[PDB]
Nucleic acid binder design. Sequence first.
DNA 1: GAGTAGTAAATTC
DNA 2: GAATTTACTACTC
Length: 69
Amino acid sequence: EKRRDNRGRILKTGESQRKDGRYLYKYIDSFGEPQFVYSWKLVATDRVPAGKRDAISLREKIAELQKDI
DNA sequence: GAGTAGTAAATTC
DNA sequence: GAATTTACTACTC
């Protein structure tokens, strides 16, 4: 009934979590084909499993798509 | 449009 | 020195 994270936090539509537990944000772009955006942190404050690469939380990537990239 | 599973390729501590 | 991540589609509701 609702998309939950790998713990107990509620994710917003469009967002979810791959199979590795990382966050994923799929969205139909103006091209006519879904777009994959990867991220381990839902916000730029959490952390990331050791061995994983660093990146701005999906909320920061998304903010670029909604603002003006 | 929303999300999943599987993969092809390249990269990293 | 080995193990891991990314990208798109295909199918589904």
